[PDB]
Design a protein around this nucleic acid. Structure first.
Ligand SMILES: Nc1ncnc2c1ncn2[C@@H]1O[C@H](COP(=O)(O)OP(=O)(O)OP(=O)(O)O)[C@@H](O)[C@H]1O
Ligand SMILES: [Mg+2]
Ligand SMILES: [Zn+2]
Length: 692
DNA sequence: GCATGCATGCGCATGCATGCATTATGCATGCATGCGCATGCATGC
DNA sequence: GCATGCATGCGCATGCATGCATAATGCATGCATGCGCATGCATGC
């Protein structure tokens, strides 16, 4: 006889029920503790409805049930549910008021083949698969214990159990003996949670030359909404045919359709630690060095992205004057400078970050529209990436390639911080409180130092004016820097084969610190110094007009304040002090100067050396001087000789003179500094020379 | 005139032609709209 | 004038409300007449 035939009869049913009850009551762990005791207790503490059982323990304790389990799942699961309900109701008597049924789910199993191997042999069996979710139908109320109203009299027919295979068709009304019709009593019916899922093979495991295959699954009761589309899951289920409509009859061959019915899915002190890290005096440098571990160099960009991530504070006196606190970032770089890796890292770190590209065929669009979704076939209003990132970050790649509509939408979202829609009878305004970070390339493919930033970029001045921070990444042949970058790249390639800052914080710790600072830190400007700010602003405007190009405006000051707030948010300071103000001054001055052309940039850099030297390193400046002299000598050698020489040498007197011009008189510490050795410089006193 | 016979008369059973009562479910068709395609018009540079 | 963008345009699939097609058997009632009974009329002797 078949396994299910022996299962059906009452004798072994009751015997197996008693065996399972004893297994539940007597099962203990490897340490002697009653597993089901603690399990049912923690289930009781939250009023849950499901119980989890391992096939390994079930096979170890009672082998016959484990053997019969794969080839007769439905009846055995029903018996186990009855036994578990009896045991639980014995433990606690109140569930008759709360929950009248408890489900039993199998957790572990011997792994079963993938979606390709499922064939006729696996029908009506227990299987376990792994796949990727592609769609979900939501939550649906299915019938259970249906009550029907007669339509001739008004009698209420008793509850009928709704099986998953066929619909319930009542025979006749017990009183008037009518044959129909009947309708469902909506008020007295009981309902169940139902959801449908489509699963596709993981693209990495598909052999070359064939395509991934998909199958459908059904989740019920507590399993609903346990998976998001695009995730990777593992199911334990029943491979089924016996549902009405599976046979193809209207035309074609007699082909059956298969469906899987699933029953399991397998995918305080921190505040004190945050405060302790804040107590450390150099937390700011730790955070600055913690950004983008995989990218070498570009320390200024990481420092700016720190403020961009931490953000500021909006201010709106009354309902009249709105001032944002989001610090936008724009990057312009020559090819090969890894602009996109920064955006990828930011998306990885940020809790809510949206990524899109202006070139085309983006997964998420940049404009709101109303459409019937291709997958769910529903009439939806799909807002752009700007709307979806409320209090989040929006990332745009290939900023220049955007067409007219994208530029218009971005301008509207940046200047008004709201998106207006008038389409298909729908008129709306949606909030776009988001921070914008963008990357782009110059017009000719290479940055021109003799032209302004606006002349080098395809964008317009109004769009550029919105961004608080502008960064320029220019590629220049430095042998030592190129050597280090190549070393890092080759090391990364070798490592991933299949066979200044003391210590950066952990990524999860950084996330927790960011969340805590955003939630509970609100620095106050009650200690600002207006005299110094006003004097510096006046002097900056004066010398900008003296040079005669791109004068400063009040907007920059606002950015400074925001940056100051961001810095005060880094140290968990509740009040703004002079250090944050000076750092924001340095950042704003660097951003403003870097956008000028050669002569103006040089003059401004020379004149404003006082402010730009805040918390700077003298050794770095001396290294810059040495690099400039080395570059001059190398250029002269290449132009005259026609080829480079084997050695580079430079007198110490020129370096000393330039340091005196910058008011530096001692260089022994620079000689003993690590920066001197890192660039493979040497100093010879026998000739008073520097060799590289 | 009294004794007897008896053709008439009445009520309840069965047999047989007409007549009376009952009664939801499953399958097919046209309207709306997505998706791939080629022609063609209009707009730049 | 030639190169490119693109709003308009067309044909065949599915999904969903209305609409279309099907289709004898069993049980009840009144008319005709047999069978037992008591009254009553008519006819003998
Ligand atoms: N400093 C760096 N550290 C690590 N990798 C780098 C660095 N600079 C460049 N790369 C590598 O250079 C490659 C160039 O690709 P990438 O997408 O990063 O370029 P991009 O700057 O976005 O260029 P494009 O202007 O073409 O969009 C990448 O594989 C990146 O890892
Ligand atoms: Mg890129
Ligand atoms: Zn009824």
């Amino acid at each position: 006889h078949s396994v299910r035939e022996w299962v059906s009869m009452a004798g072994p049913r009751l015997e197996i029920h008693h065996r399972f009850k004893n297994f539940l009551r007597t099962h203990v762990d490897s340490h002697g503790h009653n597993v089901f005791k603690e399990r049912i207790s923690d289930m009781c503490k939250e009023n849950r409805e499901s119980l989890v059982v391992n096939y390994e323990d079930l096979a170890a304790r009672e082998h016959v049930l484990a053997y019969f389990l794969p080839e007769a799942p439905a009846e055995l699961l029903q018996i186990f549910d009855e036994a578990a309900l009896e045991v639980v109701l014995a433990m606690y008597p109140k569930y008759d008021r709360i929950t009248n049924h408890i489900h039993v789910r199998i957790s572990h199993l011997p792994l079963v083949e993938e979606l390709r191997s499922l064939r006729q042999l696996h029908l009506n069996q227990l299987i376990r698969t792994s796949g990727v979710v592609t769609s979900c139908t939501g939550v649906l109320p299915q019938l259970s214990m249906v009550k029907y109203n007669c339509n001739k009299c008004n009698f209420v027919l008793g509850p009928f159990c709704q099986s998953q295979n066929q619909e319930v068709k009542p025979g006749s009304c017990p009183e008037c003996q009518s044959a129909g019709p009947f309708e469902v009593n909506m008020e007295e019916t009981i309902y169940q949670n139902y959801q449908r899922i489509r699963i596709q093979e993981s693209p990495g495991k598909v052999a070359a030359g064939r395509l991934p295959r998909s199958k459908d699954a059904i989740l019920l009761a507590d399993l609903v909404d346990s998976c998001k589309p695009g995730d990777e899951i593992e199911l334990t289920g029943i491979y089924h045919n016996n549902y009405d409509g599976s046979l193809n009859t209207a035309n074609g061959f007699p082909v059956f359709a298969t469906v899987i019915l699933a029953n399991h899915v397998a995918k305080d002190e921190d505040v004190k630690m945050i405060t302790s890290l804040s107590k450390d005096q150099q937390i700011g440098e730790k955070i600055f060095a913690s950004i983008a571990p995989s990218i070498y160099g570009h320390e200024d960009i990481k420092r700016g992205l720190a403020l961009a991530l931490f953000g500021g504070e909006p201010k709106n006196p009354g309902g009249k004057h709105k001032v944002r606190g989001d610090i936008n970032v724009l990057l312009c770089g020559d090819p090969g400078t890894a602009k996109s890796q920064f955006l990828k890292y930011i998306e990885k770190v940020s809790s809510r970050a949206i990524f899109t590209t202006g070139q085309g065929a983006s997964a998420v669009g940049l404009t709101a529209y109303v459409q019937r979704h291709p997958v769910s076939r529903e009439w939806t209003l799909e807002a752009g990436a700007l709307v979806l990132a409320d209090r989040g970050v929006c990332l745009i790649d290939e900023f220049d390639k955007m067409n007219d509509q994208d530029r218009t939408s971005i301008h509207e979202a940046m200047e008004q911080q709201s998106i207006s829609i008038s389409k298909a009878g729908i008129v709306t305004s949606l909030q776009a409180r988001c921070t914008v970070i963008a990357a782009a390339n110059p017009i000719g493919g290479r940055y021109d130092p003799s032209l302004t930033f606006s002349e080098n970029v395809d964008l317009t001045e109004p769009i550029i004016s919105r961004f608080d921070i502008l960064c320029v990444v220019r590629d220049t042949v430095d042998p030592v820097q190129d050597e280090m970058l190549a070393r890092f790249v080759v090391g990364s390639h070798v490592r991933h084969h299949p066979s200044y800052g003391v210590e950066p914080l952990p990524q999860e710790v950084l996330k927790k610190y960011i969340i805590y600072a955003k939630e509970r830190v609100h620095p106050k400007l009650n200690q600002m110094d207006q005299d110094k700010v006003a004097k510096m602003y006046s002097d900056l405007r004066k010398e900008s007009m003296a040079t005669g190009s791109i004068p400063i405006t009040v907007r920059h000051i606002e950015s400074m304040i925001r940056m100051a707030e961001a810095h005060a948010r880094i140290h968990l300071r509740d009040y703004v002090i002079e250090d944050d103000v000076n750092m924001a001054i340095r950042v704003m001055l660097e951003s403003f100067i870097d956008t000028q052309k050669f002569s103006v940039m040089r003059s401004m850099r020379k004149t404003f050396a006082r402010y730009l030297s805040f918390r700077r390193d003298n050794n770095e400046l001396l290294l810059f001087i040495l690099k400039q002299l080395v570059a001059e000598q190398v250029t002269y050698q290449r132009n005259r000789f026609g080829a480079q020489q084997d050695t580079i040498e430079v007198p110490e007197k020129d370096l000393v003179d330039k340091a005196r011009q910058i008011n530096i008189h001692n260089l022994s510490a620079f000689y003993d500094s690590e920066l001197f050795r890192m660039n493979k410089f040497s100093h010879d006193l026998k000739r008073k020379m520097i060799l590289q």
